[PDB]
Structure formats: structure tokens, C-alpha cells
Amino acid sequence: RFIERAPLVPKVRREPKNLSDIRGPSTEATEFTEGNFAILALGGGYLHWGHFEMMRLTINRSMDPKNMFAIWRVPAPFKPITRKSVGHRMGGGKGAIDHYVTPVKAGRLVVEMGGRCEFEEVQGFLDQVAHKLPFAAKAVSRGTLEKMRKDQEERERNNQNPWTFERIATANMLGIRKVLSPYDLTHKGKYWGKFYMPKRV
């Protein structure tokens, strides 16, 4: 599953800058697949090949194949970046092509670790590597994931505030949808732009 800087079969049609594929809740590949530790992305960011390579090199330094392993969920970089190199002003034709990039959304697993290992080696190195990634992320386990998600549900349920974003947004309460986006109706006021505020119920 090793990857390369640029796709071996680049798309012929020069795709535009599609950014609506990062500012939302991750829907595919959210859950584990026969793993115990992993990295959960608390934000949404573009990973270049360098980030992937550094992640691989940093994880490789604590590997023993007989005990634990790690497999990648993210696909290979497959989105063009338009060069428009230095020396120009705004406008005047679309630029050249740079190395391709891969997207990641909030609440997404980049690489999942499996095996019967110790619970603190992750806090030894995966904490570092999560701090390394270009977007907000954390090192999570099955029990911790369950705790966080169930507590999020409880907070959304045992909220004594009479008003939430759901009610004020869906019902267009104070003429509010004049200053929101349609995506807000389904994001529920938790994904402002490309970020993800979790403390909001």
C-alpha cells in the first residue's frame, strides 16, 4: 500500500479546486476495522505526500511485527494542485500542475493500529505524530473513543439550555438563515468552515 508523490495515471481533465469535500463530517471510514489504537482527525485538512512519508517514518520506529501493526485507511494523493509559479500577477490563465494531495475530514481515522500491545507506547509516539499532522488530531483507543462519543451524546441529551442550534436554525427563528449557510442546517453548528468545535452540543 506504499504510495508515490504523484498519481501514475493523472486525470486528463483539469479538475477545479473542489473544497466542499473537506468542510463536513466524515461519513466513510469513520469506524475501526479490527484495530485497537488509531489516530482520529479532529479537523479537516489536506495531506501532502510529505506528511504521509513523515507519518510512516515516525511510526516505523516503534514496530515489532510479531506483536503490533498499523494499516492505512487514507487513499493515495489524487487531487491536482495548480502551480501558477512566481513571476505573475492575478489572472492570465490557469497554471501548471503540482504534486497531488489527499483530503481528510473531521472525525476520520488516518491510520489504524492493531495488535495486543501496551496502552502507553501510543502516548509515547503516536501523540507526537498526531501533534505533527497538519490538522487537529488525537491518538484514540476503543474504550476512549466509546467514552468520548457516549459523553458527547449525553451532553447533547442532558442540556438544560432551552435553545440549541437545531431549533433556532431549522425553524429559521430570528430570521437567522439570512446569516447562515444551508449546510448549517445539517452540520448543526459544529463545523464552522473547515474546523470542528466539539464542545458545542
Binding site: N158, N161, T164, L174, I176, G189
Partner: peptide
């Protein structure tokens, strides 16, 4: 981490989560 329109700011402030007060403080009672 761009700034929000002001009315969106007020909406975010008014709808902020308020947690249910515990019946008793754990320090002075289990």
C-alpha cells in the same frame, strides 16, 4: 480560524451548552 459575522456570534453564545448542576458537591458527599 476566521471571524464570524456578529449575529452568528450572538447565536453561538446564546445556544452555548449549560450543564446540569449536580445535586450535591462530590467533595463534601460521595
Amino acid at each position: 480560524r476566521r471571524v464570524m459575522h456578529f449575529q452568528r456570534q450572538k447565536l453561538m453564545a446564546v445556544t452555548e451548552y449549560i450543564p446540569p448542576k449536580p445535586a450535591i458537591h462530590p467533595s463534601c458527599l460521595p
